[PDB]
């Protein structure tokens, strides 16, 4: 439970640490096509998941609902070339319902995210 609370509500749901500093003044705007790599896991340590297992970047449009709340929030704070760690309570992820069989109810998740690039719609 180290790191900066990047939630709107300030409920320590989404905690971030920058591990490697990006560059540019610019963070992605809502609706940018965003290119990352990521290593992700449950905090209980029973499942792991990486962009690298698909040997290709992970692509998604920011704030257009295609990843969990925490990713839309977290990635909008990052600059090109930033590596960050996010620690994510279930309210910002898969909630009490979970997303079986991958994620159990009320799972806390961890990710390491490298923002590779972003381009305007
Ligand atoms: C690429 O496959 C998945 C990866 C994760 C979760 C999934 O569904 C719950 C997955 O199945 C379909 C995709 C869901 C989109 O996933 C997400 O919003 C977040 C952020 C984008 C990367 C993927 N992701 C996930 O929660 C992973 C999950 C997998 C298990 C380790 C913890 C992280």
The closest-lying atom of ligand 1 relative to the alpha carbon of residue 38 is 22
Method by which the coordinates were obtained: X-ray
Nearest to 109 by CA among 36, 20, 44: 44
What is the CA(37)–ligand 1 centre distance, in A? Answer: 13
Helix (H) or strand (E) holding 22: none
Nearest to 117 by CA among 49, 50, 60: 60
Q: 25 has which bridge partners? A: none
Tell me the resolution in Å.
2.3
As annotated, the active-site residues are 38, 48-49, 68, 94, 111
Rounded to the nearest 5 degrees, what angle is found at the Cα of 116, between the Cα atoms of 77 and 18?
40
Q: Quote the CA–CA distance of 83 and 19 in Å, as a whole number.
A: 5
| Domains of the chain by residue range | 1-121
Instruction: Indicate if ligand 1 lies below 6 Å from the C-beta of 52.
Output: no
What's the Cα-to-Cα distance from 2 to each of 12, 14, 39, 84, 90, rounded to whole Å?
10, 11, 19, 13, 17
Instruction: Indicate if ligand 1 lies below 6 Å from the C-beta of 49.
Output: yes
**DSSP-assigned letter for residue 73:** H
């Amino acid at each position: 439970e180290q790191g900066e609370d990047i939630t709107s509500k300030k409920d320590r749901g989404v905690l971030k640490i920058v591990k490697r500093v990006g560059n540019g003044e610019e963070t992605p705007m809502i609706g940018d096509k965003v290119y990352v790599h990521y290593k992700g896991k449950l905090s209980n340590g029973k499942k792991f998941d990486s962009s690298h297992d698909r040997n290709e970047p992970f692509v998604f449009s920011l704030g257009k609902g295609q990843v969990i709340k925490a990713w839309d929030i977290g990635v909008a704070t990052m600059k090109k070339g930033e590596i960050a760690h996010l620690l994510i309570k279930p309210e910002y992820a898969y909630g009490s319902a979970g997303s079986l069989p991958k994620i159990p109810s009320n799972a806390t998740l961890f990710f390491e995210i490298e923002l590779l690039d972003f381009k305007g719609e």
